[PDB]
C-alpha cells in the first residue's frame, strides 16, 4: 500500500527533464517497495552515496543498500505515501543530468500514529550506453 | 591565512576530473576568503543549493550566498576522498568530505566536518557550479 | 457534531453559503467521508498544514492518506470572517476548536487557525486553498 | 534590503504575475518599515493570522502599524509562489518566505515562515484583504 | 457529591442567599454529571471562559455537554468566601473560590483550586446562568 | 496608547454599545494610569480576580491604585470579540479577549493575551464596574 | 497503630492534660479512619488550614469526611512538645509538632513531619475542636 | 510605603478594631525597619514561628533585631481578611493573609504571600504581641 | 549479626574498656532488635539526635521501640576508633565511627557509615545510655 | 554577636543552668572568632564530630584554630530547647538545636540550623568542653 | 547472516596488500561470527590491543578477547578506504574505517562507526595480527 | 619548559626496540616544542593518521598537522610534562616496527590549574633507506 | 574463573616471581569466593583501604569475610606488576587490576582498579598484611 | 603546620621514626621543598595517585612537575597504622585530612587515604612506593 506522487507546479519541464523525473520516481518506488531488482536496474553498480545511514562517510556499491532491501520489514505491515516537492532538473549535456528535490514521506510509526518526514535529496544521473543510471545520490535531513 | 588541501591518497585521476578538483579548490578558496568576485566567476547565476543555511529548503540564485559574503565577520579546509564522476562532455559531479580546522574564541583549535556534493556544467567552454548540496551528519 | 458560532447577526446570503460549505467540509473531515470531501475540494488544491512540515502540498492524495487511517469529537468554529471576492471568489477564515479523547480516558482540546479559499468553478464552489496553523 | 522571487524556471500569466510583483512591493514595505506604501497596498479592514496575534484573528492596520514604529541588513527569498485566480476581482497567492538576517550577536540566522495572502480588486486596484502567516517547528 | 458553602461569619441578605443556592445546584449537576439539572440552570446561549477553552470564549451548551457525555462516585467541592452582588432586579454576579477534592490514577487524595465568576440573569422570573469565567492561578 | 475594538459581525443595541464604550475608557485609564478616570468608572468596593491576586479575590481600589502610582510609553491594546449581555435595566456583563502589544526589557515587541470579564452595575443613573475577572491561558 | 505524646520535662496542669488526651483521641480517629470518634470530638462548623486545602480555610465535616472514605495498616504518630495555653474555661489552644512514621508504595520506613495548631472550645460541657491548622516545612 | 487592611464585609467590634490597628502599626514598623516602634508593640519574650526560623520557635527580640540592622524604598503590604477572636480582656488572636508588593533585584513588580497568626496579650493596660506565626504556601 | 571493634593502638583503662563493651552490647541489641536488652542498657528518658528525628531532639524509648517492632538476616557492624573519655565516677562519653555492611533491595552489598556519640551515666551502680547523637556525612 | 538561650517554660536547676552559660560563652567565642576565650573553655585534647571533619573524628585545637585564623560583624545565634543532663559531680552533657542567622554573598538574610551535643568535664573545679558533635539534617 | 564488504573505490592495491585486506576481512568475519578457532588462527597469541573494552589500557594475550567470544549473546561490516602500508618483507599495517550496519531491539536499523589499525607480522611464512587499535571518535 | 620521560619498567628491551623508543621520544618532543623541522625529519611525508582532531576520518600528509605547528600558542606561555607509560615495541622484520604506549601529559589549563590528560597511541615505523620514519599513527582517548 | 598476569615481556627475579604467583592465588580465592585459601594467604590483622570501606581503614578478616558469604563468568587481568622487595621479610607489589564481567543484563562490562598489596614473611611463610584498592573516575 | 593523631599510646621506637619521616615527607610536600622530598624518597618510586589517572607512575619527574607550580594550610593525619617488615621494610598507612582555602575566601576540607611503603637502603629509610586514594 504505497504510491509516489510528483507535483512540478504550473511549471512545465523539458521532455528530457520529465524523463529524469519519471526515472527518479521509479527508483523511489523501488526503495519503498523494497524491490531490489528494479532498484538495481536504475542505479549504477558503482554509485557513491551521502546519506545519514553512512554517518558522514561516503559509501560506494550496492551492498550497503541491499542490506536495507534484504532486511527491514517487508512492506505489508504498514502503508506509506511519498511525495516529491519542487523537483529541479538540470540537464548536463547529452549524458549527464542532476535532479534535486524535497522528499516528504507520510507513514505510521510504532503505534497507530501518523507522522511526516522530510529529507532533501540530490540525485545525479548518467546516460551510459543509452540508459540513464543513478551514479551518485546525497540525502540530508534538516535539524 | 587560508589554504586548501586535497588528499587523493593512492588513486589516480584523469586530467578532466583533476581539473574539476582544482576548480572546486578555487571555489572553496573564494568561500573561505569571502572573495565574491572569484566565487561569482566559478558559480552559475541560477545555481540550486541544499545547505543547512536554507533550513531544508532548496534555494536558487546568488543573492542567498552573497548575503553571507557580506555581513559575516585562520582556517585550513581539507578535501577528503574527492570522488569525481564525469558526465559526458558537459557534465561533472564531485563529492567529498570537507574537513575544516579552525580557531575558536580563544586560541582554541576545533575541527568541523561537512559532506559536500557539487555538480559542474560546461556552459560555453567554461565550467560552472550549477548545484551543490552541503550536509552535516548527526553531530 | 460541529457547531458554528457567528456570535451575533446573520451573514449575507452569499457568504452564509460559504459558511455552510465549510461546515460540510469539516463534516467530511471528522467523519472521514472522502466522497463528500472530494466533491467540495478542487483536485489541484494547495495546502499549508503542520502535517506538511512547513512545505506547501498540492493534490488530494496527500490528504487522502489521512482518510485511510483511524468516534465522538466536538469541533467548534470561532468568529468566522467571510470576505467575498467578486462573483467567483470567496475567502473564509476562522478559529477551529476541537474536543476529543487522547490515548487515556482524558478529554483534551486542540486549537488551530484555518483559512480556506473557495472558488466558484462552473457554478459550483470548490475549496482551492487552505492554510491551517497551530499556535504555541 | 533586497527581495528575490523564485518562481522556479516558469513564467506565470500576465494577471498573476502582477499579483507576484505587488506581493514583492508589500514585503518591501514590511522589511523597509515604510507604512505609506503598505497602507496603499492593504485594505483598511484586513483580517490577519500571524504568530504575533497569538492564535487570534486580528483586523485593521493599527495592529500592524504598531510594528512599523519600532526599530530601524536582511535578505528575503520567496519560495514556490502558487497563485490561483478567483474570477476577475479575487486572487489567492501562497508562498514560503525565507528570511536571512543578523540576530543579537554578529551571527547569521535564517527563519522560515509560510504565508498566504488573499487580494481583492476593489475599484480597479488590488488590495490585500487577508493574510495568514504560519511558522513550522 | 456533596457541596459545602462557607458564608464565613455573619449572614447575608436573602436574595444573595438564593443565588448561592442556585450556584450550589449548578455545581452539583457538574460533579454528579447530571446534564438535565445543568440545562435547567443554564441559558442555552451561555458564554464561557474556562481553561478547557484555551483562552477562547465559547458559547452554547454543546461545548460543556461534550464533557457530560464522556466520563463516569468520589468528589467533594467547597465554595470559599462567596461574594454576591445584586444587579437591580434581573441581574446577579456571584464570584468565589472553588475547592475540589478527588482521587486521580493512584489512590492518593488531591485538591484542585479554581476561581469562578458566574453571572445570573432573571429571565421570566427564574434565574439562569448566562456567563461564567473559570480561572486557575499558578 | 491606542485601544481598538473589533466585533466580528453585528450591531449592538444602544445600551450595550455604551457598555463597550465605558469598558474602552476604563482600559484607557489603566494604560494611561490616570487613577481619577479609573475611580470614576469603577465602584469603590469592586471585587476582582486577577493574576496579581494569586488566585485570591481582592476588594477595593487601593490594591489596584498601587499599580497606578509605581510603574510609572507606546503600547497597543486590542479588544477582541466583545460579548455584551445586559441584565435587566441596572445590570450588564461584558466579556472579551484582550491583546496587548508592547516593548519589554529588550528592543523586541511582545504580545500578551488575557481573557477579561467585567460586570457593570447602574447606581443612581451611573454605570460603575463592580467586579472584573482577568485570567491568562 | 498507636499515638505517643512527649511532654519531655515538667508536668502540665490537670486542665491542659485533658486537652492533650483529647488531641490524642482525635489523631487516633484520624489514623484509624474512624469518623464516628472524629465527629464526636470535632465541632460540625470547624474551620481548617491544611495543605490539602491549598492555603484556603475550609468549613464543615464533609471536606474531611471525604478522606475517611478512602484507603484502609501500621503507622506511628508522635506528638512532639505540646504547648497548651488555656483561655478561661471555654477556650484552649494546643500547638505541637506531629511526627508520622509509616510505609509508602515500596517497602520502606519513613518519617513525615507536620506542625499542627488546634483550638478547643468547651460547648455545653464538652470540649470540641473548632479550628485546626496544618503546616509543613520545606 | 503604606499598609492597607481589607475588612471586606460587615463591621468588627470596637475591641478587635484596635487589634487590627495595632497589627497595622506592627507591620508598619517592620516594613519601615523602625525597631523602636516594633519594640513598643512586642513583648520582649516573644515566641516566633517563621520560615527564617527553619521550623523552630525562637524567643526574644534580638533574633528579629538582626533583620532591622540590614538593608534600607517602596513596598505595599495588605492585610487580607483579618479574623480576630477575643479571649476575655487580656487575650486576642488575629490571623490574616499578608500580601506584599515590591521590587526585587531587577526592575519588576511582584506579589509575595505569607499567612500570619499573631497573639496579643494585654499586659499592664497595653496590648503586646507575645507570639506570631509566619507561614508560606507552596 | 557480628559487631567487631578495632582500636588503632593502645590499651584502655578497665572502666572505659567496660564502656566499650556496653556500647557493643547496645549495638548488638539494635541489630538483633531485642528491645529488652536495649531497654536494660538505655535510660528510659534518653535524649537523641539521629537522622530519623529530622534534626529534632527526641526523648524516651517509644520513638526507638517503633523500629524494634516493625523491620522486622546477615549484617556486619564494624566499630572504628572508639574514643572513650570518662567523666569523674558517674559519667562517661564514648564516640566512634560505625560501618555497616548489609544487603539492600538488590543482591548487592552496600556499606553505610555513621558517626555516633553516646553518653553513659552510672545510676545506682548501673551504666545507662542517657543521650546519643548519630550523624551521617 | 549576641547569643539567646531559650529555656522554653519553667526553670531548670542551677547546676544545669551554669553549663548553659558556659555553652553560651563558647559559642560567643566562636561567632566573635575569639580564640582566647575558646581555648579557656575547651580542653586541649578535645574530640570533635562536625561536617568540616568529613565523617571523621578530629582531636586537638589546631583543627578549629585554623578556622579562627582565617575569616573576618553581623551574626545572631539562638540555642533552642537545651537539654542538660548532669553526670555525677564531674560530668555534664548539654544538647540543643543551634539556629544561626547571617548574611552571605549578596544582601539577603539566611538562617542555618545544626544539632549540637557538647560534653563538659569538671577538671580541677572548672568545666571544660572535652567533646562536641555537630550534625545537620537534610 | 554475516557478510563483510571492502570499498577500495578507484585505487589499485598490490597483491601483498590485497592479501592483507583479505586477511583482515577473514579476521573481522571470525569476529562477527564469534568463531574463535579462525580468530586464533589469524591472531598472534601475544597480541597487544588498544580498544574501548580495555578502558584506556593496553591488553595482551588472547584470553581478554576470548572472553568476548564466549559470554556474549544480522549485521553488515564494511571496510572503508583500507590504507595498507607494507613494512619490508615481514611487516604490514592496514588502517581503515569499520562501518557496521545492524539491527536494534526492534527490527530497527542503526549504523556504528569505529576506526581500526591492525599490524600484521609474517612469522614463519604466515601472517599474524600482532597488534590492533580500535577507536570510536567523539560520539 | 617541557621534557619527555619514558619508563620501560624492570623489563629491558632490545637495542633495536630501544632505538624505536628513543625515536618516538624525539617525535613527541617535536610535537610539544612545536618544532616542525624536527617533526618532519622523523615522519614520512605520506603518513596516515587516526586522531580525535580528524573526527573519525583518516588523514594523509603533513599539512593537517603543520596547521597545529604554525598555529596554537608558541610554547613559552605554559609548561608541559609528558610521560610514556609501558611502551610495547614489536619489531616487524628488518624494515618495520610497531610501538604502542600510553601517553600521560601534565599541564596547566586556562587558570593556574594543574591537569592530567591520558591518550593511547600506536605509532608504526618503517625503515626507508636506512632511516626510520613514522608512516602511520593512531591516537585515541578513553571515555 | 581464569586469571592472567601481564608482566610485559620480562622475567622477574625468583623471589619476586613468587610474590606474583601468591598474589594470583589471592585474587583466585577472591574471584572464586574460597575463604579458606584466602585466610591461609592473609594475615589475621590485615589493614585495608578499599572503596567498600568508604574512605576508612579497616582491619581483620571479618570485614572481607562478609563478602565471601553472598552470591555464587569473570576474567581478571593483571597489568604491569611492580614488585619492590624489602629486605628478607618484606615485599611490596602494586599493579592495575582489569576485570571483565557480566552485569545485571547480558552486557559485558569492564572495571579497572589499582591495587597495592604489602606482604610480610612471617615464620618462613608469606602473608598479606596490607592492601589498598583504588578506583579511577 | 602538620598534626599527627596517634589517638592513644606511643608506637615502638622503630615505627615512631617511620611516623616522623612521614611527617617530614608531608612537610616537604606542603612547603613545596623538593630538596628534603628528594632526600626522603627513592628515585625509582612507584606511585598510585588521582593525578596519574588510574595509571602507575615511576620516578620523581612526575611529582617534581607539581613542586614547580603555585600559604596557610592545615594537614592532619588520622589513625596511622605502621606495620614493620623485618629489618629493611616498613609500611605506614593513614588518613590524610587537609584544610585549605579554595578560589574564593571560603574554607574547604579534603580527605584522602594514603599508604606509604618505606625501605631502608644502606642504613637510611626511603619511601619506595605510595598509594593515594580519594573516597567519593
UniProtKB/TrEMBL annotation, chains A, L:
Belongs to the protein kinase superfamily. CAMK Ser/Thr protein kinase family. CaMK subfamily. This is calcium/calmodulin-dependent protein kinase.
TrEMBL record, chains D, M:
It comes from the Eukaryota. Transmembrane segments: none annotated. Belongs to the protein kinase superfamily. CAMK Ser/Thr protein kinase family. CaMK subfamily. This is calcium/calmodulin-dependent protein kinase.
Amino acid at each position: 500500500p504505497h504510491t509516489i506522487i510528483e507535483e512540478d507546479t504550473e511549471s512545465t519541464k523539458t521532455q528530457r527533464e520529465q524523463e529524469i523525473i519519471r526515472l527518479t520516481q521509479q527508483l523511489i518506488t523501488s526503495i519503498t517497495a523494497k524491490d531490489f531488482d528494479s532498484y538495481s536496474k536504475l542505479v549504477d553498480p558503482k554509485i557513491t552515496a551521502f546519506e545519514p545511514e553512512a554517518l558522514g562517510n561516503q559509501v560506494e556499491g550496492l551492498e550497503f543498500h541491499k542490506f536495507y532491501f534484504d532486511n527491514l520489514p517487508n512492506k505489508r505491515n504498514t502503508t506509506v505515501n511519498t511525495t516529491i516537492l519542487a523537483p529541479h532538473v538540470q540537464m548536463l549535456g547529452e549524458e549527464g543530468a542532476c535532479i534535486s528535490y524535497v522528499r516528504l514521506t507520510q507513514g505510521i510509526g510504532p503505534d497507530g500514529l501518523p507522522r511526516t518526514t522530510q529529507s532533501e535529496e540530490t540525485r545525479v544521473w548518467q546516460k551510459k550506453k543509452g540508459v540513464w543510471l543513478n551514479v551518485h545520490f546525497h540525502r540530508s535531513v534538516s535539524r
